[PDB]
Design a protein around this ligand. Structure first.
Ligand code: CLA
Ligand code: CLA
Ligand code: CLA
Ligand code: CLA
Ligand code: CLA
Ligand code: CLA
Ligand code: CLA
Ligand SMILES: CCCCCCCCCCCCCCCC(=O)OC[C@H](COP(=O)(O)OC[C@@H](O)CO)OC(=O)CCCCCCCCCCCCCCC
Ligand SMILES: CC1=C(/C=C/C(C)=C/C=C/C(C)=C/C=C/C=C(C)/C=C/C=C(C)/C=C/C2=C(C)CCCC2(C)C)C(C)(C)CCC1
Ligand SMILES: CC1=C(/C=C/C(C)=C/C=C/C(C)=C/C=C/C=C(C)/C=C/C=C(C)/C=C/C2=C(C)CCCC2(C)C)C(C)(C)CCC1
Ligand SMILES: CC1=C(C/C=C(\C)CCC[C@H](C)CCC[C@H](C)CCCC(C)C)C(=O)c2ccccc2C1=O
Ligand code: SF4
Ligand code: SF4
Lengths: 74, 741, 161, 60, 80, 132, 146
């Protein structure tokens, strides 16, 4: 049971990283900004700063506070 | 009179105007911050005097006064140590019963429950147990009272004030001219004859008149209360004649030449004092007296103002052979016209000397009751080993800096430096081969032993009960040192150290020092040490030699000492500067010293430190599991790290809990360093761009634009955090493993 | 109540922990003479431990099977004391800080030496601004409804926006 | 447009895109990018000015 | 070999040519700039890809650009 | 013969110089002086013509920069193949690349801002990148 | 052509060891291969997918064959809680006699690895009971991969 769970979780992580990597590749060499004018996908890049900044805020919030609670208990 | 005192009066005006203009020293930073990088630069170029002025005189005056400031800081540190001993320590109780009382000179305010860190050291006292061996040092000095410690602290504070005033005066009021600094002969004469000669002579006088009688009375069992004050040993000669009945004769034997009459307190017995477990004080007195004589003699070697003496310029020019062209022609100019060269030599020597001190102090415990203080011995050894490694790598770095900046080919034509630079390829290739050979053979011995032990083929390993690799040369040297007393050192009663051979010196049922047997495990670990040292030397020497140019970058010197790269061309040109070679050499030095400290700790716990019974039976801390378990990597992982890490992990809820917390924190910082070490600057710059957009969207935007750390700064921060994490992890590990005792 | 938690007032494990702490402190102090500074310090530690445990018992915290207090943070008002009340305080304090900082940024920013005023703080102006943070929520809301809180889309960006 | 007039940047690749900069000089002698503009912020290279064509500037 | 391209935004200050260690770049007469000169890369076979030219560029974005490509002995910085 | 007085170093050229292109640099020195070799430590340049050999053009140009910025000496650089061919490299028309020379023709010049390059998707499956 | 990596003329002309390394890391990036069109790209992807399916089925057939030929599946299905499933034998000439004695477990009579894949439980659940069934499944999978 332990082997199967660890195995499939690691494969899941690899697959997710690969999905995002191939999405980056698609943006690099397959995206056509003229064919996606005002498209949903184009609007993803239009407000990329907001996405990245709020993701950074969530990451910092979680990390700061979880690590702080762990160190407080320690 | 060629050697003369030259100064400039009122060299620099004293005012606070500059204090409000950060970055004034450098021309680039004086324009104010445009981005945050400026900030970092201001802390990185603060002490880079050579890059702030083109005149050597100004750099020399800055270095002199900065050294005065460092002396002031050191004196303040000594004052603090002595004051905390006098007011916050159990020094008196430890004096009365040194074996049972645990040294401690730090107390914690109870504010959050941290008062648990106040251990039950003893002597009706609670505090943090110290491992700096200050109590043993003070006892060796015959302190025997806290008034003396208090006055020692006051004197240290006054000396710190004097050092600060001297720095201020010698910069802003009377700054010596450059010609004053460029006196190597006079400086060496004065530092050898007086600083080191008369320093030894004065300390020998102190020992003869203060430390010797007081320590002899203490060893006899006299309570510190009944011991007369040290000044009482200077007024009535008879009071000392009772202890050493040679003062009765006085100083007349000294001048008559009958020095043999002083053998009462100037001995050469060697070995260790059975009572205190340290070196005999008379032996140290004779030692320091002989060193004082030698240093005073050596301080007259160089010519200063009277014809007699040695001219080091001629001395160097004279030594040249067929294989080395012009010989040591031009080295005197190098060492009297560039502080980086001198700093390289001095740092290398100081580091090697610190490591030698670490090796010698454990083998022959110099202070009373320091041998059985296992916590102090380990702490001192590891501390001085780390200091030595850092100093060696710093010497390498400053040699590289000299090569980049102060190296002038015109003045170095076909001399030793020129020739070394001209067969650098051969040097580095052969050092690379020897490093690979050492690594392969030494580490593959461990891998082979591990593989055979995993396969059940114990008879095929490199162990004592298997294929044997006995360090025959080291054993032969040990035997010769054992036989030296009476044959090659006839006037020495006992061997220099009991490590080589002899009885088991134990104090209070604890094994202070005993012979150390060398087996196949010692052979393998010594060759591991040699491998790591050779690799570190490879990295640092390669950084020094290829600092100016290479087959990749023929003009590396123009790029400076530390630069990130020269672009992705020619394949890739990352970490091509000498600074990056120092950056890697620091990692390898840390690795090698970690191995050295693990070897020392495990060997001493398994083979030297322990307990004795009234009969004489020996029981070591780990039961002598080093011989059959230090020969495999799994053995080190299990019997040393996993087994001896029990104290740290289980220290919660006791006075050592701070060590567990620091263990975890050091792990955290070490892992944190990898963020800087692996990642690059572009990612972080783009992330900061997004964060800056977020700030700007709310009309929050610093005028000082944020910037990701420069590539060089990224590497420096990663390395600094890596070293801090590793050092702290081992610090907590050793201190908690050796304080649960 | 909540998730099968019994109040720490009637938690046997809680009392056992209190007894263990007190008894270990007493064992530690048994090796010092009565009235010795170490003895007084240990007695004060014992008293502080007893007061802490009594305060936890009286506060109304919920104990677990391990005897340690557990925090309920689902918005329950009866347990607001655990998380909601302090959180508000934090959001106030930090809010204050943030607001004050922003104001300073937007006060010294209209100068030629704006950068020089960030490494070197104008302490008089800095304290002037800092004293105004106690009304940060009102000022923030007024700026929000007045359009002076956020910058227009006409600001720096990247090639793909 | 004129010396000393503020112009909003429109160069998409420019570090000061959508930012206001003051015109320093304008070359009437032909040239493809004659309008020299200076911005308050320094780019990653430390410079704070660039040449733009009048088509790449919004006037005000 | 690497590909070196010069765009018309160049202001012909010569800094890229000076910084070049392999003498790949040069100055040629031009009329689209005030200085009347523009950078050119006639011999990119000797380009190593160090991107010193880009580092030594005043124009907002790198009127001179370097794109790394096929590697030969010359462009690989190999004395062997 | 004309080579600068040099004691020799292990940093000189190697087998590829014999089998592949080698480089030579010539210059004129008004006086005799010591300069740093791109490979070794130091060498003395003869009064008059000095001829030197190297394995990389970058080494020759670094030495030329040293001469120009320290001893204000003009220099020439050639490439020699194993077949005996010699090609003149660094001054291509007798004037340094920094100085404008009428007659030169632009190479690798694009008549539009760097940000107007075509997207990678537009140039796909053709043996070309966006810049080409 | 002209060197190892045909799909990259630039790498083919590279004289260094890099040519080898990148030749390995650019193999499956069909888009970048010289003279590559959309149709050939799709067809090559299709054939590669066929090959990958063949690899998967041969891996499965190998598992089945090894369990059938060297496993203790019958003993396990008899008493599935106390015995440990077997993966395959260990023929390692580097072993010492104590290692051979130590790794002899389960059915025994040879050194053996205890399977932690859980394939025993899965095959037992889906209805397999004898080594003959495992062998037939493996033969079918080999034929399918062919
Ligand atoms: C079925 C799914 C799938 C498919 C069809 C592809 C196909 C492709 N990928 Mg994608 N990828 C996938 C999954 C997939 N990938 C996943 C899951 C990840 C996350 C890790 C990625 C991450 C990824 C990146 C980051 C990149 C690609 C790229 C590519 C292209 C080139 C691949 C190449 O040249 O291989 C070369 C093959 C190798 C170098 C072999 C490496 C094999 C591993 C790393 C070594 C294993 C060692 C072994 C386990 C050690 C034994 C242990 C023993 C010693 C004990 C190609 C179109 C590249 C590209 O540019 O595409 C346009 C690219 O940059 N992929
Ligand atoms: C233990 C190791 C470690 C730690 C703690 C972090 C921490 C972080 N990483 Mg890093 N990282 C690491 C290893 C680590 N990383 C490694 C090995 C890699 C692979 C190269 C990366 C790659 C990486 C990337 C690529 C990214 C991160 C991000 C993050 C952030 C995640 C959000 C978060 O937790 O915010 C909370 C912050 C922390 C937990 C950091 C510790 C803060 C401490 C507790 C404050 C101490 C202050 C104290 C007063 C210091 C006094 C100093 C004085 C004594 C001198 C955070 C800064 C992401 C990021 O930036 O998000 C914004 C991100 O994008 N990291
Ligand atoms: C030099 C080494 C050294 C070290 C490491 C220590 C360390 C310590 N000492 Mg010891 N001490 C020292 C030297 C030292 N001292 C010396 C030389 C003396 C003789 C005067 C003393 C006398 C002494 C006494 C009498 C006591 C200590 C105590 C302490 C402890 C608490 C200190 C503390 O935080 O109080 C609080 C300290 C502060 C809050 C620092 C003040 C903060 C200032 C104002 C910050 C200013 C920074 C400024 C902005 C920077 C710019 C410069 C500006 C001026 C222009 C601590 C373990 C105490 C102790 O152990 O209690 C049990 C205690 O009672 N020490
Ligand atoms: C001759 C008197 C004398 C005496 C009694 C001691 C006694 C001691 N020394 Mg010292 N030492 C001396 C002279 C002396 N030393 C000299 C002259 C040197 C200079 C090389 C040293 C260098 C030295 C080091 C580096 C160390 C000691 C250490 C020790 C202790 C080790 C235990 C022992 O048995 O030592 C026995 C000591 C010896 C066997 C050393 C004898 C050295 C001989 C005399 C060298 C003579 C050189 C000769 C005069 C050269 C002249 C050349 C000139 C004319 C050009 C002990 C307290 C160790 C210590 O304290 O560590 C905690 C330690 O690490 N000694
Ligand atoms: C006699 C000792 C000595 C002296 C006088 C110098 C002097 C100098 N060094 Mg050298 N150096 C030394 C030892 C020394 N170094 C050693 C031992 C090493 C090996 C690590 C080096 C490695 C080294 C390198 C690699 C470089 C220098 C450079 C310099 C120059 C600039 C230093 C500077 O600006 O400081 C700035 C000081 C700081 C920014 C402080 C940082 C201190 C560290 C990173 C943190 C310390 C952490 C602390 C101990 C514990 C923290 C605890 C935590 C919980 C908070 C200056 C000429 C630089 C240069 O270019 O010179 C030409 C340079 O590149 N040195
Ligand atoms: C534990 C990880 C590890 C290992 C094994 C190595 C190994 C090595 N490093 Mg590296 N290094 C590491 C971590 C490691 N390093 C880290 C973390 C850093 C960051 C600071 C560096 C930074 C670094 C630098 C900067 C340098 C090295 C150097 C070296 C070499 C030292 C010479 C030597 O021992 O050759 C012998 C090789 C070994 C001992 C490796 C183990 C091989 C075993 C014994 C045999 C293996 C089985 C055999 C091959 C079977 C073959 C068949 C099989 C393929 C099927 C060697 C290649 C130096 C170098 O290359 O110059 C000499 C050098 O300059 N390293
Ligand atoms: C007063 C200044 C100020 C203000 C108003 C903000 C406001 C904000 N920041 Mg920023 N930030 C600041 C300073 C400031 N920050 C500094 C100094 C740093 C460097 C450490 C950062 C680094 C930073 C990151 C990396 C991120 C934010 C984010 C955010 C947002 C969410 C809140 C947050 O995560 O805080 C986080 C705050 C920190 C990590 C450090 C704050 C340190 C102190 C407390 C602030 C400076 C106070 C200063 C002394 C002002 C003195 C005023 C006085 C002179 C009068 C919010 C827009 C996040 C975002 O984009 O959300 C969308 C995000 O990801 N900030
Ligand atoms: C201390 C070092 C001892 C070993 C020195 C080897 C002879 C060294 C020796 O006798 O050198 C002497 C040799 C002779 O130089 P001259 O006598 O002409 O130089 C006169 C001097 O005063 C310098 O001007 O110098 C060299 O050739 C240097 C390059 C040496 C090339 C050989 C290097 C071999 C290194 C590896 C050997 C390791 C052995 C084990 C080390 C523990
Ligand atoms: C019924 C129900 C449920 C559920 C719900 C839900 C709703 C869920 C969902 C879930 C989900 C919903 C999930 C999702 C996830 C997502 C993801 C995971 C994503 C990812 C993404 C990506 C990966 C991207 C990619 C890309 C890129 C990168 C770019 C572009 C291109 C592409 C797109 C490719 C429960 C029971 C719980 C509760 C109750 C009810
Ligand atoms: C620890 C310390 C301290 C203190 C110290 C002390 C107090 C010291 C002292 C010291 C001393 C107190 C010294 C002395 C010295 C002396 C000497 C060094 C002498 C010499 C002599 C001689 C050399 C002589 C000679 C002669 C004679 C005999 C006469 C005749 C002739 C002749 C000239 C030959 C303090 C607290 C501050 C702080 C910290 C540090
Ligand atoms: C995280 C990270 C950054 C971003 C890190 C930054 C900008 C440092 C942020 C420092 C903050 C703002 C200061 C406060 C930090 C602590 C709270 C305490 C001070 C610590 C010392 C400065 C005294 C880089 O810029 C970088 C660059 C190159 C290689 C790797 C990296 C890298 O790993
Ligand atoms: S990756 Fe960084 S260090 Fe390496 S060449 Fe590029 S910029 Fe320089
Ligand atoms: S450095 Fe840039 S602006 Fe200057 S000449 Fe070269 S390409 Fe033109």
């Amino acid at each position: 049971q332990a082997a199967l769970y660890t195995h499939h979780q690691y494969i899941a992580g690899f697959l997710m990283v690969g999905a995002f990597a191939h999405g980056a590749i698609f943006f690099v060499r397959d995206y056509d900004p003229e064919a996606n004018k005002n498209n949903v996908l184009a609007r993803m890049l239009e407000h990329k700063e907001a996405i990245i900044s709020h993701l950074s805020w969530v990451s910092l919030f979680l990390g700061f506070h979880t690590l702080g609670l762990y160190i407080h208990n320690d | 009179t060629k050697v003369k005192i030259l100064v400039e009066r009122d060299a620099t005006a004293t005012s606070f105007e500059k204090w409000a203009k950060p970055g004034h020293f450098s021309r680039t930073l004086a324009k104010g911050p445009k981005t945050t990088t400026w900030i970092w630069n201001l802390h990185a170029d603060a002490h880079d005097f050579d890059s702030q002025t083109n005149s050597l005189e100004d750099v020399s005056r800055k270095i002199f006064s900065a050294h005065f400031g460092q002396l002031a800081v050191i004196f303040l540190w000594l004052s603090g140590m002595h004051f905390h001993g006098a007011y916050f320590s159990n020094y008196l109780a430890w004096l009365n019963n040194p074996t049972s009382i645990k040294p401690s000179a730090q107390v914690v305010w109870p504010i959050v429950g941290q008062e648990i860190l106040n251990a039950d050291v003893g002597g009706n006292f609670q505090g943090v147990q110290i491992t700096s061996g200050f109590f043993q040092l003070w006892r060796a000095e015959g302190i025997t009272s806290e008034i003396q410690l208090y006055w020692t602290a006051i004197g240290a504070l006054v000396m710190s004030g004097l050092m600060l005033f001297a720095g201020w005066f010698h910069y802003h009021k009377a700054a010596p001219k450059l010609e004053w600094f460029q006196n190597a002969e006079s400086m060496l004469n004065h530092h050898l004859s007086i600083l080191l000669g008369l320093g030894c002579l004065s300390w020998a006088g102190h020992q003869i008149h203060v430390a010797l009688p007081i320590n002899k009375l203490l060893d006899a069992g006299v309570a510190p209360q009944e011991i007369p004050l040290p000044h009482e040993f200077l007024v009535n000669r008879d009071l000392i004649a009772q202890l050493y009945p040679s003062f009765s004769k006085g100083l007349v034997p000294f001048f008559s030449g009958n020095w043999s009459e002083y053998s009462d307190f100037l001995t050469f017995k060697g070995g260790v004092n059975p009572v205190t477990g340290g070196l005999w004080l008379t032996d140290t007195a004779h030692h320091h007296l002989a060193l004082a004589v030698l240093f005073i003699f050596a301080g007259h070697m160089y010519r200063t103002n009277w014809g007699i003496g040695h001219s080091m310029k001629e001395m160097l020019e004279a030594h040249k052979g067929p294989f080395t062209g012009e010989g040591h022609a031009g080295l005197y100019e190098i060492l009297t016209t560039s502080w980086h060269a001198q700093l390289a030599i001095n740092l290398a020597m100081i580091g090697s000397l610190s490591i030698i001190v670490a090796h010698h102090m454990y083998a022959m415990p110099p202070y009373p009751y320091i041998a059985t203080d296992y916590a102090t011995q380990l702490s001192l050894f590891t501390h001085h080993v780390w200091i030595g490694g850092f100093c060696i790598v710093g010497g390498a770095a400053h040699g590289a800096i000299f090569m980049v900046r102060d190296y002038n080919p015109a003045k170095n034509y076909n001399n030793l430096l020129d020739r070394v630079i001209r067969h650098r390829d051969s040097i580095i290739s052969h050092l690379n081969w020897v490093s690979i050979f050492l690594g392969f053979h030494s580490f593959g011995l461990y891998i082979h032993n591990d593989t055979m032990r995993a396969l059940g083929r114990s008879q095929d390993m490199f162990s004592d009960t298997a294929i044997q690799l006995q360090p025959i040369f080291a054993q032969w040297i040990q035997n010769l040192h054992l036989l030296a007393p009476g044959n090659t050192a006839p006037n020495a009663l006992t061997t220099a150290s009991y490590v080589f051979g002899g009885d088991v010196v134990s104090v209070g049922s604890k094994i202070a020092i005993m012979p150390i047997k060398l087996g196949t495990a010692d052979f393998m670990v010594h060759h591991i040490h040699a491998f790591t040292i050779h690799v570190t030397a490879l990295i640092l020497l390669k950084g020094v030699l290829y600092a100016r140019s290479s087959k990749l970058i023929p003009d590396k010197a123009n790029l400076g000492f530390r630069f990130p790269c020269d672009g992705p061309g020619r394949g890739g040109t990352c970490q091509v500067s000498a600074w990056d070679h120092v950056f890697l050499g620091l990692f390898w030095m840390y690795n090698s010293l970690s191995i050295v400290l693990f070897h020392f700790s495990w060997k001493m716990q398994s083979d030297v430190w322990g307990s004795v019974t009234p009969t004489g039976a020996v029981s070591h801390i780990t039961g002598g599991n080093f011989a059959q378990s230090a020969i495999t990597i799994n053995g080190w992982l299990r019997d040393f790290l996993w087994s001896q890490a029990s104290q740290v992990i289980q220290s919660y809820g006791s006075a050592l809990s701070a060590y567990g917390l620091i263990f975890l924190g050091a792990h955290f910082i070490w892992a944190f360093s990898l963020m800087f070490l692996f990642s690059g600057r572009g990612y972080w710059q783009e992330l900061i761009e997004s964060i800056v957009w977020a700030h700007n969207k709310i009309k929050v935007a610093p005028a000082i634009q944020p910037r990701a750390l420069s590539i060089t700064q990224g590497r420096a921060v990663g390395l600094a955090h890596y070293l801090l994490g590793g050092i702290g992890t081992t610090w907590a590990f050793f201190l908690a493993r050796i304080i649960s005792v | 109540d909540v998730a099968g938690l019994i109040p720490c007032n009637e938690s046997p494990v809680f009392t056992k922990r209190l007894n263990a702490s007190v008894v270990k402190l007493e064992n530690r102090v048994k090796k010092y003479e009565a009235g010795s500074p170490p003895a007084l310090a240990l007695e004060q530690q014992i008293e502080r431990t007893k007061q802490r445990f009594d305060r936890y018992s009286k506060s109304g915290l919920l104990c677990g099977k391990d005897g340690l207090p557990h925090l309920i943070t689902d918005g329950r008002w009866s347990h607001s004391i655990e998380f909601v009340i302090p959180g508000l305080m934090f959001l106030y304090i930090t809010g204050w800080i943030g607001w004050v900082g922003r104001k300073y940024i937007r006060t010294v920013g209209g100068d030629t030496n704006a950068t020089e005023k960030e490494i070197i703080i104008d302490v008089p102006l800095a304290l002037k601004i800092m004293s105004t943070g106690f009304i940060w929520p009102i000022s923030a809301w007024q700026e929000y409804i007045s359009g002076t809180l956020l910058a227009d889309v006409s600001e720096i960006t990247v090639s793909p926006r | 447009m004129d010396k000393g007039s503020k112009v909003r940047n429109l160069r998409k690749e420019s570090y000061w895109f959508n930012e206001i900069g003051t015109v320093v000089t304008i070359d009437k002698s032909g040239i493809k990018y004659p309008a020299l503009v200076r911005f308050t912020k320094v780019n990653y290279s430390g410079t704070n000015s660039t040449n733009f064509s009048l088509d790449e500037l919004q006037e005000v | 070999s690497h590909a070196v391209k010069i765009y018309d935004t160049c202001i012909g200050c010569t800094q890229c040519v000076r910084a070049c260690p392999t003498d790949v770049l040069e100055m040629v007469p031009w009329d689209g700039c005030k200085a009347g000169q523009i950078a050119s890369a006639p011999r990119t076979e000797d380009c190593v890809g160090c991107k010193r030219c880009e580092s030594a560029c005043p124009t907002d974005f790198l009127s001179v650009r370097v794109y790394l490509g096929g590697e030969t002995t010359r462009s690989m910085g190999l004395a062997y | 013969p004309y080579s600068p007085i040099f004691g020799g170093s292990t940093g000189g050229w190697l087998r590829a110089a014999e089998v592949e292109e080698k480089y030579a640099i010539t210059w004129t020195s008004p006086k005799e002086q010591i300069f740093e070799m791109p490979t070794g430590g130091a060498a003395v340049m003869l009064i008059g013509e000095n001829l030197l050999y190297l394995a990389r053009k970058e080494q020759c140009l670094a030495l030329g920069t040293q001469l120009k910025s320290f001893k204000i000496s003009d220099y020439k650089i050639y490439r020699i193949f194993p077949s005996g061919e010699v090609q003149f490299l660094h001054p291509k028309d007798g004037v340094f690349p920094e100085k404008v020379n009428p007659g030169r023709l632009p190479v690798g010049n694009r008549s539009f801002s760097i940000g107007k390059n075509p997207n990678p998707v537009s140039v796909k499956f053709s043996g070309q990148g966006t810049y080409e | 052509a002209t060197k190892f990596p045909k799909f990259s003329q630039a790498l083919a002309q590279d004289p260094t060891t890099r040519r080898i390394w990148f030749g390995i890391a650019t193999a499956h990036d069909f888009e970048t291969h010289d003279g590559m069109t959309e149709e050939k790209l799709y067809q090559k992807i299709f054939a590669s997918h066929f090959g990958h399916l063949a690899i998967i089925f041969l891996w499965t057939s190998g598992n089945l064959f090894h369990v059938a030929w060297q496993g203790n599946f019958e003993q396990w299905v008899l008493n599935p809680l106390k015995v440990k499933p077997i993966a395959h034998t260990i023929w390692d000439p580097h072993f010492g006699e104590p290692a051979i004695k130590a790794f002899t477990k389960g059915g025994a009579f040879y050194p053996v690895n205890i399977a932690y894949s859980g394939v025993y439980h899965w095959w037992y659940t889906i209805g397999m009971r004898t080594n003959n069934d495992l062998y037939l499944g493996s033969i079918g999978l080999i034929i399918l991969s062919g």
